[PDB]
Design a protein around this nucleic acid. Structure first.
Lengths: 262, 124, 180
RNA sequence: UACCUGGUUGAUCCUGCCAGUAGCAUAUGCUUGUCUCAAAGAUUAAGCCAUGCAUGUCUAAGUACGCACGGCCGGUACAGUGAAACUGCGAAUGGCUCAUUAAAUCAGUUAUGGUUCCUUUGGUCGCUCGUACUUGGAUAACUGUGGUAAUUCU
RNA sequence: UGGUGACUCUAGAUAACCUCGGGCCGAUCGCACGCCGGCGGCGACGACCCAUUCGAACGUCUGCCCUAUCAACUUUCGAUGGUAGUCGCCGUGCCUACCAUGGUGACCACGGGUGACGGGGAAUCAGGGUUCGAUUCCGGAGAGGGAGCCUGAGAAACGGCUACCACAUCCAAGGAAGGCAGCAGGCGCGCAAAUUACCCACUCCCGACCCGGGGAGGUAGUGACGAAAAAUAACAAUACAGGACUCUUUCGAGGCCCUGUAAUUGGAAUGAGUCCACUUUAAAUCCUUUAACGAGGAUCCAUUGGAGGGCAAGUCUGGUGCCAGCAGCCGCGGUAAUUCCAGCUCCAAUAGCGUAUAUUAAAGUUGCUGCAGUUAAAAAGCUCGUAGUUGGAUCUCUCUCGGCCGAAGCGUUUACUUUGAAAAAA
C-alpha cells in the first residue's frame, strides 16, 4: 500500500472493543493520538456502545460537537479520539466522570469516579532525557512531555499528573511491594503487588506479580503499570479489584447471583 | 382488550436533551399498534405533548402478543428538530426530502465539471 | 466485503450404508413411533447424540481434577439434565454414554403434547403444533422439534386464541354456522 | 461407528486390482409449495469494452465591490446569505483481481544503537545584542474581443 | 548532567562555517469586550525542532510444492570479501576505483516445471494422514505490456502525466482523445457465474465541514452454490381384519387397543393463495400482527431413481427376440427376458433426487503408526567403500544488607520434559 491506511475493518478491530460481526463492515479507525490503535478506546465506542448515550455514530457526532465531552480536562470533538489507560472522561452536562481502567477480562470498564478524583491521573514514565541547555524532560504513556521532573523519577515509575496544570504532584517508584496493574498480555487487567523482577539484558525483563488472593503471574516489564505505593492504590479500582477468577468461581458467583435475584 | 404500553430500559439523555426507552405494547388480539396510538399513549403516560415523542423500530413477536420498539421523548420541539434524524422528522411531517434522485444529481455534477466559471450555473 | 455472516453447519449425517435392512427397520420404527416426517429427523437426533457422546468421550480421557474436564463436563451434564434427558441423580460423565436416541426424541414438543394429553395421537400432535394451537409458557410454538425443558414442561397449553383454548371458533365452524 | 461388498476357478485358498459405498466441490438433468440465512464471470480470456455512475470538500474563524438575492439608519471600508474563482486539504484510503512471484512473497520471532514519517497529542515557539497603528508586485473570478470541425483546448 | 547490556547516546565547552535553488525565530483570522489612547480574555490557522501516534522501509532466526531424462553453479559486464568514496531517507557490491580469490552445493546448490500469490483457514479423517486455500481477514503484487517521471509527508499512482509496443475512438485529414483485474452492463470465451435498480437511513471514510460527498457500504432484484426450520393432512362413528393382560368353546359371544380399498359417512383444524390495515424501511419489499375470502378426488394431485446380485424392493402381465436396448462391475437379451420397451405393483431418499468430473475416507492398494519382496510384482552378480543412518558396559557453604539473615554465578554445553512470558480477529 502507498501511504497510510485510513480504514479499520470490523473484524480486524481490537477484540476488547466488543463489537459485533453484523453491524457493518467497518469499525471506527481511531485517530492518531496519545494512545496506540490497539490499546485505546475511541470516543464513539465509549459514547455509543458502552454508555448507550447514542444509538448511531451521528448521535455521537452531535454529542461531541456540542462540546460536552472532556478528555483529561480538555474538550475533544473528535469522535474517533483514542482514549486509553488512566484517562479521564468528564461529562459535565450529566455531571459524571469516568476513568479508563481495564477489567480482569482485559476490557476497558465503565468505571465512574468522583469529581474530585477526576482532577488527576497516573502516568507511567516511558523515558527521561536531558535536552537543550540541560533541561530534563520526561515522556509518559500519554505521549505528554513534562519539563523539569523530579531527579528521582526514572523510567517505569508512575507520576500523578494534575490535569488542570499538567504538572507532576507525586510519584511512585518501580520497586517490589508496590501495587501494579497489568496493561497488556494474557494477564491484562490484573492488579497485584510486585514480588520480583528478572533482568534480561538485551531482551525483555520479566516482572512477577502476586495477587491480593495469593495468585501469582508474570508479565513483561512494559506491561506493568505501578498503580499505588505499597498495597494501597492511588486510584479507585473497578468492581473486581484486579482478581481474575477462574471460570469455575465465576460460574459459582453467577449461580449465587441467580439464586439471590431469580 | 386494551392496548397497554410499558417502558423497559429508560434513560434520561441530557446530552441529547431527551429520554430514551424500550416500548412494549400488549395488543393480544389486534394488529401491530400504529405509531401514532403509541405516541398519544406515551404522551398520556409521561405527561407531555405527543409531538415531542418519536417511536420507531416496532417488531411484533411471533404468536401475536407483544410488540417491542424504541421511543424518544424530547424536552421541546426545537430540540427534537435539532437532534432527530431527518427521516423520523419527515414521518411527523416536519421535513421534506430532496425531490431529486441520485442519478440526476450525479450526472448534473459531472456535467458541470465540463463548464468553467459562472457558466457552471447554466447547466441543469 | 459484506456485513454478512457465513456460519452454517449441517445438523445431520447420512448413514454410510444406504440399504442396511436392520437400520432401515429401526429408523422406520422411530419415525412411526414418534410421528416423524422423514429419516433426516432421526439422523438429526442421532447426530446431536453422537456429538454429545464425542464430547463426553473427549472429557473422560482427562484427569479427574483437570479444571477443563470439571467445567465442561459439569456444563454438559447440566445441559442434559435441564432438557430432561439425564436424571439429576445420574450426574456423571459415564451416564452420558448410556443415553439413547429415544431419550432425546421423547423431549420433543410433539411427543410432549401427545403425552400431556392435548392430542389424540402423535400425528395429531404434529398437526396441532404446526397449526398454532399450542403455546409453551406464554409463547405460541410452531415447531414440533422444540425440545421442551424441565421447567418449561409444566406450561404447555392450548394457546389463548385457539378454538381448543380461548374463543374465536375456526373458519370451518364459522362457515357452517353461517350456512345454517 | 476404528465397517466393508460383487468380479479370475469345475470347485478352493490367496495376491491383486477393477467395480460398488459415504462425504465434499464445480457443472448438468428432472422436479419444486412455505420460511430463514446465503455463495455467485475465480477456473477458459491479467481477453476487449458502447453508455451512465464510482472523489470530492467551507466553518463564527484564508480571499466576497457578481444587486444573484438582500436591511433594524446606509457619507457607513466591510450588515447578511452567497454562485464563481484563487487558496488549503484529500484524491497514496477504499474497491477489484491473482498475471507475475519458489528463500521471492508470506508466517512466527527479533532489530533499527542503520532511516523517514502528513496528521493527532504533549513540550518548545521575547532564550538571537544586530512602513512595524502592517511592506511589494501580480493573477483568477468578473467585463470585453476572439481562434479551432473537434476536448474539462484556450 | 542524565541514560543503555552496549554509543562515536544525551547534555556541556571551544574554533569557525551556515547553501542565489538562502532555516526557524507569526506583517494571518473570528467572538466577547471598557478610561487620559494602555492593558487583556477564549479561540481559529500557520511554522522550524523534540517526543516511534499511524505507519512505511530495510535487516535477524526458522519454516514452502514437483523434478537428477537438471551435478556442479557464480566469478567477462559484482560473483564472495576488504579499503576509500558516490548515490540513497538510511545499513549494504547499492553503484564506482583499487585490492584479495573468494562465495554455494548430494544436508540437493544451479537449472526446469507449477492448471503456484503466501498465511489465517477448508473438505475429509479412529489414532496417523490426504487433498485444497482465485475468493470478503492480514500481508504482497498489478491496473493492456514495458519503461520514465511530476506533485506530494506518502506514488515509480495509472478513475495522474510522458513515450514506445498492441489495440482502438472522433476528424472538415490539419488534428484531438484512450485504458471497467471499480459498480452495473455488453461482446468474446467457454461445462461454468446475477440488475445498465434504490439510498447515504446503518457501518465507517474523506473535506475548510455538526451541514457536503462516498456503485466504499447498505437495500432490494436474479439465485435449488450451499445451510437451518418445515406443509402435502388430523380425528370420530358404522364394516371388515388383528389381537387381548374377557367368557373361554381350536364352534363362537366380543365398539378393550389397534387397521383398511371403505377411494363409506361426518363435522372439526389449518395455511399455501387472494386481499385490507398496521408494522417494517431512507422509501419500500420480505418476515411478524389483524380482519375478510380461502379444502374433500381437501384435483390446493411430490418427485427423482430403482425392483437378478453387490443393494431395499416382482422368475407378475403384454411387446421384442444377441434386434432394440440395459449393464459403474458380474452380467441380461439368440420365443415363459426376475435385468430391454411398457402396464401394474413394490422401496429408497424426499422438496428433493439422478449424471459427469476433481478430491477425501474406504487404501494396512504408498504402510511414520502400518504393507510387501522363496514360488503371486519384487534382494543389486559379488565384495570394498565416503557421506547418510545406527552404535556395547561403566561415574550416587563465597560480592555494599537495618528478616547460617537481601546474593552471586565466572563455574561443565546442549537435546529431552515440565513451567512461565509473548503470541490479530474471524
Amino acid at each position: 500500500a502507498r501511504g497510510p491506511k485510513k480504514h479499520l475493518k470490523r473484524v480486524a478491530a481490537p477484540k476488547h472493543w466488543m463489537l459485533d460481526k453484523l453491524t457493518g463492515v467497518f469499525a471506527p479507525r481511531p485517530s492518531t493520538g496519545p494512545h496506540k490503535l490497539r490499546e485505546c478506546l475511541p470516543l464513539i465506542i465509549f459514547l455509543r456502545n458502552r454508555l448507550k448515550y447514542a444509538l448511531t455514530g451521528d448521535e455521537v457526532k452531535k454529542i461531541c460537537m456540542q462540546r460536552f465531552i472532556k478528555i483529561d480536562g480538555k474538550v475533544r470533538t473528535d469522535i474517533t479520539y483514542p482514549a486509553g489507560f488512566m484517562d479521564v472522561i468528564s461529562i459535565d452536562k450529566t455531571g459524571e466522570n469516568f476513568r479508563l481502567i481495564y477489567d480482569t477480562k482485559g476490557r476497558f470498564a465503565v468505571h465512574r469516579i468522583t469529581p474530585e478524583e477526576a482532577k488527576y491521573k497516573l502516568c507511567k514514565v516511558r523515558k527521561i532525557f536531558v535536552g537543550t541547555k540541560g533541561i530534563p524532560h520526561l515522556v509518559t504513556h500519554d505521549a505528554r512531555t513534562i519539563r523539569y521532573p523530579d531527579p528521582l523519577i526514572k523510567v517505569n515509575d508512575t507520576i500523578q499528573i494534575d490535569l488542570e496544570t499538567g504538572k507532576i504532584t507525586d510519584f511512585i517508584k518501580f520497586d517490589t511491594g508496590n501495587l501494579c496493574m497489568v496493561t497488556g498480555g494474557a494477564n491484562l487487567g490484573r492488579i497485584g503487588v510486585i514480588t520480583n523482577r528478572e533482568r534480561h539484558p538485551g531482551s525483555f525483563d520479566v516482572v512477577h506479580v502476586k495477587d491480593a488472593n495469593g495468585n501469582s503471574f508474570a508479565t513483561r516489564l512494559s506491561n506493568i503499570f505501578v498503580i499505588g505505593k505499597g498495597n494501597k492504590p492511588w486510584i479507585s479500582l473497578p468492581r473486581g479489584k484486579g482478581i481474575r477468577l477462574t471460570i469455575a468461581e465465576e460460574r459459582d458467583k453467577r449461580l449465587a447471583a441467580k439464586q439471590s435475584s431469580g | 382488550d386494551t392496548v397497554t404500553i410499558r417502558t423497559r430500559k429508560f434513560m434520561t439523555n441530557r446530552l441529547l436533551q431527551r429520554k430514551q426507552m424500550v416500548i412494549d405494547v400488549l395488543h393480544p388480539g389486534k394488529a401491530t399498534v400504529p405509531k401514532t396510538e403509541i405516541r398519544e399513549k406515551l404522551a398520556k403516560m409521561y405527561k407531555t405533548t405527543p409531538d415531542v415523542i418519536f417511536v420507531f423500530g416496532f417488531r411484533t413477536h411471533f404468536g401475536g402478543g407483544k410488540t417491542t420498539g424504541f421511543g424518544m421523548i424530547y424536552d421541546s420541539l426545537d430540540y427534537a428538530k435539532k437532534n432527530e434524524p431527518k427521516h423520523r422528522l419527515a414521518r411527523h411531517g416536519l421535513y421534506e426530502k430532496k425531490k431529486t434522485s441520485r442519478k440526476q444529481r450525479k450526472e448534473r455534477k459531472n456535467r458541470m465539471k465540463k463548464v468553467r466559471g459562472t457558466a457552471k450555473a447554466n447547466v441543469g | 466485503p459484506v456485513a454478512r455472516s457465513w456460519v452454517c453447519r449441517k445438523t445431520y449425517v447420512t448413514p454410510r450404508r444406504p440399504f442396511e435392512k436392520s437400520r432401515l427397520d429401526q429408523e422406520l420404527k422411530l419415525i412411526g413411533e414418534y410421528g416423524l416426517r422423514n429419516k433426516r429427523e432421526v439422523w438429526r437426533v442421532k447426530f446431536t447424540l453422537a456429538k454429545i457422546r464425542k464430547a463426553a468421550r473427549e472429557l473422560l480421557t482427562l484427569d479427574e481434577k483437570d479444571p477443563r474436564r470439571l467445567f465442561e463436563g459439569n456444563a454438559l451434564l447440566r445441559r442434559l439434565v435441564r432438557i430432561g434427558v439425564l436424571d439429576e441423580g445420574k450426574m456423571k460423565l459415564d451416564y452420558i454414554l448410556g443415553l439413547k436416541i429415544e431419550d432425546f426424541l421423547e423431549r420433543r414438543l410433539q411427543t410432549q403434547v401427545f403425552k400431556l394429553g392435548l392430542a389424540k395421537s402423535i400425528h395429531h400432535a404434529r398437526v396441532l403444533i404446526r397449526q398454532r394451537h399450542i403455546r409453551v409458557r406464554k409463547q405460541v410454538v410452531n415447531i414440533p422439534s422444540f425440545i421442551v425443558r424441565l421447567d418449561s414442561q409444566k406450561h404447555i397449553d392450548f394457546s389463548l386464541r385457539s378454538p381448543y383454548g380461548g374463543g374465536r371458533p375456526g373458519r370451518v365452524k364459522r362457515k357452517n354456522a353461517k350456512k345454517g
